[PDB]
């Protein structure tokens, strides 16, 4: 999921940027 | 945004540099 890949570790930058809205 | 665990803060932090603002967001979904 989100935190699962962003908090527990590091997610993809472009994917982390898609977090916008 | 280096690779060393991010979580909310880092997100909103990176998100603050990857998007700047424009009302960005980041949830568990």
PDB file of N, CA, C and O in Angstrom, chain B:
ATOM      1  N   UNK B   1      14.866  13.875  -1.233  1.00  0.00           N
ATOM      2  CA  UNK B   1      14.185  12.627  -0.790  1.00  0.00           C
ATOM      3  C   UNK B   1      15.119  11.432  -0.997  1.00  0.00           C
ATOM      4  O   UNK B   1      15.116  10.801  -2.036  1.00  0.00           O
ATOM      5  N   UNK B   2      15.918  11.117  -0.015  1.00  0.00           N
ATOM      6  CA  UNK B   2      16.851   9.963  -0.155  1.00  0.00           C
ATOM      7  C   UNK B   2      16.092   8.662   0.136  1.00  0.00           C
ATOM      8  O   UNK B   2      14.923   8.679   0.462  1.00  0.00           O
ATOM      9  N   UNK B   3      16.742   7.533   0.018  1.00  0.00           N
ATOM     10  CA  UNK B   3      16.041   6.244   0.288  1.00  0.00           C
ATOM     11  C   UNK B   3      16.343   5.775   1.714  1.00  0.00           C
ATOM     12  O   UNK B   3      17.298   5.063   1.955  1.00  0.00           O
ATOM     13  N   UNK B   4      15.531   6.161   2.658  1.00  0.00           N
ATOM     14  CA  UNK B   4      15.763   5.731   4.066  1.00  0.00           C
ATOM     15  C   UNK B   4      14.462   5.886   4.858  1.00  0.00           C
ATOM     16  O   UNK B   4      14.375   6.683   5.772  1.00  0.00           O
ATOM     17  N   UNK B   5      13.449   5.136   4.513  1.00  0.00           N
ATOM     18  CA  UNK B   5      12.150   5.246   5.237  1.00  0.00           C
ATOM     19  C   UNK B   5      11.617   6.676   5.095  1.00  0.00           C
ATOM     20  O   UNK B   5      12.351   7.637   5.212  1.00  0.00           O
ATOM     21  N   UNK B   6      10.351   6.829   4.822  1.00  0.00           N
ATOM     22  CA  UNK B   6       9.796   8.201   4.653  1.00  0.00           C
ATOM     23  C   UNK B   6       8.600   8.404   5.580  1.00  0.00           C
ATOM     24  O   UNK B   6       8.582   9.293   6.410  1.00  0.00           O
ATOM     25  N   UNK B   7       7.597   7.597   5.423  1.00  0.00           N
ATOM     26  CA  UNK B   7       6.377   7.724   6.270  1.00  0.00           C
ATOM     27  C   UNK B   7       5.630   9.014   5.917  1.00  0.00           C
ATOM     28  O   UNK B   7       5.846   9.606   4.879  1.00  0.00           O
ATOM     29  N   UNK B   8       4.736   9.438   6.769  1.00  0.00           N
ATOM     30  CA  UNK B   8       3.950  10.675   6.486  1.00  0.00           C
ATOM     31  C   UNK B   8       4.875  11.887   6.345  1.00  0.00           C
ATOM     32  O   UNK B   8       5.052  12.420   5.266  1.00  0.00           O
ATOM     33  N   UNK B   9       5.445  12.339   7.429  1.00  0.00           N
ATOM     34  CA  UNK B   9       6.339  13.533   7.376  1.00  0.00           C
ATOM     35  C   UNK B   9       7.196  13.511   6.107  1.00  0.00           C
ATOM     36  O   UNK B   9       7.061  14.362   5.251  1.00  0.00           O
ATOM     37  N   UNK B  10       8.081  12.560   5.971  1.00  0.00           N
ATOM     38  CA  UNK B  10       8.930  12.528   4.749  1.00  0.00           C
ATOM     39  C   UNK B  10       8.043  12.725   3.531  1.00  0.00           C
ATOM     40  O   UNK B  10       8.296  13.565   2.697  1.00  0.00           O
ATOM     41  N   UNK B  11       6.987  11.980   3.434  1.00  0.00           N
ATOM     42  CA  UNK B  11       6.073  12.166   2.281  1.00  0.00           C
ATOM     43  C   UNK B  11       5.776  13.659   2.184  1.00  0.00           C
ATOM     44  O   UNK B  11       6.407  14.379   1.435  1.00  0.00           O
ATOM     45  N   UNK B  12       4.831  14.117   2.952  1.00  0.00           N
ATOM     46  CA  UNK B  12       4.476  15.573   2.959  1.00  0.00           C
ATOM     47  C   UNK B  12       5.754  16.402   2.764  1.00  0.00           C
ATOM     48  O   UNK B  12       5.733  17.458   2.160  1.00  0.00           O
ATOM     49  N   UNK B  13       6.864  15.921   3.250  1.00  0.00           N
ATOM     50  CA  UNK B  13       8.137  16.672   3.065  1.00  0.00           C
ATOM     51  C   UNK B  13       8.551  16.533   1.601  1.00  0.00           C
ATOM     52  O   UNK B  13       8.591  17.497   0.861  1.00  0.00           O
ATOM     53  N   UNK B  14       8.824  15.333   1.165  1.00  0.00           N
ATOM     54  CA  UNK B  14       9.190  15.126  -0.259  1.00  0.00           C
ATOM     55  C   UNK B  14       8.047  15.672  -1.106  1.00  0.00           C
ATOM     56  O   UNK B  14       8.237  16.454  -2.017  1.00  0.00           O
ATOM     57  N   UNK B  15       6.851  15.273  -0.782  1.00  0.00           N
ATOM     58  CA  UNK B  15       5.662  15.769  -1.525  1.00  0.00           C
ATOM     59  C   UNK B  15       5.717  17.293  -1.570  1.00  0.00           C
ATOM     60  O   UNK B  15       5.256  17.920  -2.503  1.00  0.00           O
ATOM     61  N   UNK B  16       6.284  17.889  -0.561  1.00  0.00           N
ATOM     62  CA  UNK B  16       6.385  19.372  -0.525  1.00  0.00           C
ATOM     63  C   UNK B  16       7.456  19.828  -1.515  1.00  0.00           C
ATOM     64  O   UNK B  16       7.474  20.960  -1.955  1.00  0.00           O
ATOM     65  N   UNK B  17       8.350  18.949  -1.870  1.00  0.00           N
ATOM     66  CA  UNK B  17       9.423  19.323  -2.835  1.00  0.00           C
ATOM     67  C   UNK B  17       9.125  18.702  -4.196  1.00  0.00           C
ATOM     68  O   UNK B  17       9.550  19.191  -5.222  1.00  0.00           O
ATOM     69  N   UNK B  18       8.407  17.619  -4.207  1.00  0.00           N
ATOM     70  CA  UNK B  18       8.089  16.957  -5.497  1.00  0.00           C
ATOM     71  C   UNK B  18       6.915  17.673  -6.166  1.00  0.00           C
ATOM     72  O   UNK B  18       6.800  17.709  -7.376  1.00  0.00           O
ATOM     73  N   UNK B  19       6.041  18.232  -5.384  1.00  0.00           N
ATOM     74  CA  UNK B  19       4.864  18.942  -5.961  1.00  0.00           C
ATOM     75  C   UNK B  19       4.849  20.395  -5.488  1.00  0.00           C
ATOM     76  O   UNK B  19       4.325  21.270  -6.150  1.00  0.00           O
ATOM     77  N   UNK B  20       5.419  20.659  -4.349  1.00  0.00           N
ATOM     78  CA  UNK B  20       5.436  22.057  -3.829  1.00  0.00           C
ATOM     79  C   UNK B  20       4.141  22.331  -3.061  1.00  0.00           C
ATOM     80  O   UNK B  20       4.150  22.551  -1.866  1.00  0.00           O
ATOM     81  N   UNK B  21       3.025  22.315  -3.738  1.00  0.00           N
ATOM     82  CA  UNK B  21       1.732  22.571  -3.045  1.00  0.00           C
ATOM     83  C   UNK B  21       0.573  22.107  -3.936  1.00  0.00           C
ATOM     84  O   UNK B  21       0.322  20.925  -4.070  1.00  0.00           O
ATOM     85  N   UNK B  22      -0.143  23.018  -4.545  1.00  0.00           N
ATOM     86  CA  UNK B  22      -1.281  22.611  -5.414  1.00  0.00           C
ATOM     87  C   UNK B  22      -2.194  21.671  -4.629  1.00  0.00           C
ATOM     88  O   UNK B  22      -2.941  20.897  -5.193  1.00  0.00           O
ATOM     89  N   UNK B  23      -2.137  21.736  -3.328  1.00  0.00           N
ATOM     90  CA  UNK B  23      -2.999  20.850  -2.496  1.00  0.00           C
ATOM     91  C   UNK B  23      -2.601  19.389  -2.712  1.00  0.00           C
ATOM     92  O   UNK B  23      -3.373  18.593  -3.208  1.00  0.00           O
ATOM     93  N   UNK B  24      -1.402  19.028  -2.341  1.00  0.00           N
ATOM     94  CA  UNK B  24      -0.962  17.617  -2.523  1.00  0.00           C
ATOM     95  C   UNK B  24      -1.508  16.770  -1.372  1.00  0.00           C
ATOM     96  O   UNK B  24      -1.987  17.289  -0.382  1.00  0.00           O
ATOM     97  N   UNK B  25      -1.444  15.472  -1.487  1.00  0.00           N
ATOM     98  CA  UNK B  25      -1.969  14.618  -0.388  1.00  0.00           C
ATOM     99  C   UNK B  25      -1.270  13.257  -0.393  1.00  0.00           C
ATOM    100  O   UNK B  25      -0.537  12.919  -1.301  1.00  0.00           O
ATOM    101  N   UNK B  26      -1.502  12.475   0.624  1.00  0.00           N
ATOM    102  CA  UNK B  26      -0.869  11.128   0.708  1.00  0.00           C
ATOM    103  C   UNK B  26      -1.550  10.344   1.827  1.00  0.00           C
ATOM    104  O   UNK B  26      -1.364  10.622   2.995  1.00  0.00           O
ATOM    105  N   UNK B  27      -2.352   9.381   1.482  1.00  0.00           N
ATOM    106  CA  UNK B  27      -3.061   8.601   2.530  1.00  0.00           C
ATOM    107  C   UNK B  27      -2.639   7.138   2.478  1.00  0.00           C
ATOM    108  O   UNK B  27      -1.687   6.779   1.821  1.00  0.00           O
ATOM    109  N   UNK B  28      -3.347   6.292   3.171  1.00  0.00           N
ATOM    110  CA  UNK B  28      -2.996   4.847   3.169  1.00  0.00           C
ATOM    111  C   UNK B  28      -3.641   4.168   1.960  1.00  0.00           C
ATOM    112  O   UNK B  28      -3.184   3.146   1.490  1.00  0.00           O
ATOM    113  N   UNK B  29      -4.704   4.731   1.450  1.00  0.00           N
ATOM    114  CA  UNK B  29      -5.382   4.119   0.272  1.00  0.00           C
ATOM    115  C   UNK B  29      -4.513   4.314  -0.972  1.00  0.00           C
ATOM    116  O   UNK B  29      -3.766   3.406  -1.295  1.00  0.00           O
TER     117      UNK B  29
END
